[PDB]
Design a protein around this ligand. Sequence first.
Ligand code: HEM
Length: 154
Amino acid sequence: MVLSEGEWQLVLHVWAKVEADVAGHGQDILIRLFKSHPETLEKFDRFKHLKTEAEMKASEDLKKHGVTVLTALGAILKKKGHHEAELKPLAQSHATKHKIPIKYLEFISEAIIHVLHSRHPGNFGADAQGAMNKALELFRKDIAAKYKELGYQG
Ligand code: HEM
């Protein structure tokens, strides 16, 4: 797929808003993922003892991991689809070490969109939502192609 120059502009405009509070966004996104799809929590040995939202919000290490996730995702989005070199280390760890199906990437894409609405109620319209969905779909499609390049069925 291909985004218009105007769609990338929208994605990068919304991402500047994330970059102003990376830790807050990343913490909310992982908690939403875990509450919506508790099976994903079992993939995190360090976090699977957390059982309630209130324990999750008090974990400093969960927040740190949020920053890690969004920092990587931001570097990719800023490439406006010219991201092959950034995807390779990511596909490698997620396919071969963590053993994350592409389905779980759809789940965290849903959590990102939900948290962007929850944190930016008047700043994230249908046009920006559509552009971000396209950019995240482009990401998931290209990382599924990198899983296959590595010999895995995501
Ligand atoms: C936007 C999608 C994602 C991005 C950019 C991302 C990025 C990262 C990065 C940068 C790391 C640390 C380095 C590494 O191991 O590669 C990491 C670790 C990890 N990721 Fe992801 N990730 C994503 C989605 C997911 C999902 C949906 C899952 C599981 C449900 C997952 C499972 C894990 C696990 C288990 C680790 C190791 C955690 C630990 O340190 O204990 N990732 N991820």
